[PDB]
Amino acid sequence: GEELFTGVVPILVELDGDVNGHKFSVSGEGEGDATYGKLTLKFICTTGKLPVPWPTLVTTFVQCFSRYPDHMKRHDFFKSAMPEGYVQERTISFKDDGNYKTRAEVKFEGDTLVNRIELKGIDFKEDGNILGHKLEYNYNSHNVYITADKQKNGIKANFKIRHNIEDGSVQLADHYQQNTPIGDGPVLLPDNHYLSTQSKLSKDPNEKRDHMVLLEFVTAAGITHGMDELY
Ligand SMILES: *N[C@@H](CCCCO)C(=O)O
């Protein structure tokens, strides 16, 4: 599977969502270059205005594009599941507000890596930071710890995303994530490690539709003692 990621790979993201009486769809396109852990993606809301803030969907919108160091190649579950792919399921709980439930399948369709997502939003406050669009349009860097779930033949992660709010506070979005292979081909089940992520959000000055431009870099890390010994 890792052979499929040696070059630049086109990406398609499709999300079907339902939150607070609003059905919405998002399509995203761009490319990933796993050699540098680099993602360049532009998302468009094709149904009108997005009924939740763009930053709340960044994690939902392809960790197979993470840069795994040579010394950590045996820990890359995500690429090992390719091309048949993996299911990624999350609960995202917004502190003192509602939650997202997401299920995605990530797999190749020919040369294109496709992330197809179903999202449901539950129990949000009409006046809250999410439905009230009170999040700043920016994004923090996070370290996501990955552990094996070997009886389920996959991996899991839980992590809290920090969203800056326009009132100067920071609202946490608590993520619980599980990934399972779609195919029956053996996958790599990793030792504990983490993914170091950084994301920049911007706008296309020629785009009339509601949209988000995302530039993201992800690097696997945390396995250091063996390499440190060399020096
Ligand atoms: N590279 C050092 C050893 C690192 C000490 C911790 O492993 C050296 O060559 O002396």
Author numbering: 4 to 64, 68 to 237
Task: Provide the authors' original text about this structure.
Chromophore formation of green fluorescent protein (GFP) is a built-in type of posttranslational modification, i.e., the chromophore of GFP forms by an autocatalytic reaction of the backbone involving cyclization, oxidation, and dehydration reactions. For recombinant expression and purification of green fluorescent protein (GFP), one of the variants of GFP, GFPuv, was used in this study. Here, we demonstrated that the second posttranslational modification is generated at the side chain of the C-terminal Lys238 residue of the GFPuv, a mutant of GFP, when over-expressed in E. coli BL21 (DE3) pLysS strain. We determined the crystal structures of GFPuv form I and form II at 1.65 Å and 1.28 Å resolution, respectively.
Furthermore, the mass spectrum of the H231GMDELYK238 fragment ions from GFPuv form II was also better matched to the theoretical mass spectrum of the fragment containing the Lys238 converted to 6-hydroxynorleucine, in terms of the isotope pattern of ions. The results of the mass spectrometric analysis, described above, indicated that the mass increase of ~1 Da in GFPuv form II is most likely caused by the conversion of an amino group into a hydroxyl group occurred in the side chain of Lys238 residue at the C terminus. The mass spectrometric data supports that the conversion of an amino group into a hydroxyl group occurs in the ε-amino group of the Lys238 residue. This modification causes a decrease in the net charge of the modified form of GFPuv (named form II) from that of the unmodified GFPuv (form I) at the neutral pH. In addition, the charge difference occurs on the molecular surface, not the interior of the β-barrel structure, because the Lys238 residue locates on the solvent accessible α-helix. The C-terminal α-helices of GFPuv form I and form II also show almost the same structure in each other, except for the slight differences in the side chains of the C-terminal residue and the adjacent Glu235, where the electron densities at the end of the substituent groups in form II are more disordered than those in form I. The overall structures of GFPuv form I and form II are almost identical when these are superposed, showing 0.145 Å rmsd for Cα atoms of 233 residues, though slight differences arise mainly in the conformations of the turns consisting of Asn23–Gly24 and Asp155–Lys158. The regions around the chromophore of both forms show almost the same structure, although the alternative conformers of the side chains of His148 and Thr203 could be modeled in GFPuv form I and form II, respectively. The fluorescent properties, the overall structure as well as the structure in the vicinity of chromophore are almost the same in GFPuv form I and form II, although their chemical composition at the C-termini is different. These seem to be due to the fact that the modification site is ~30 Å away from the chromophore.
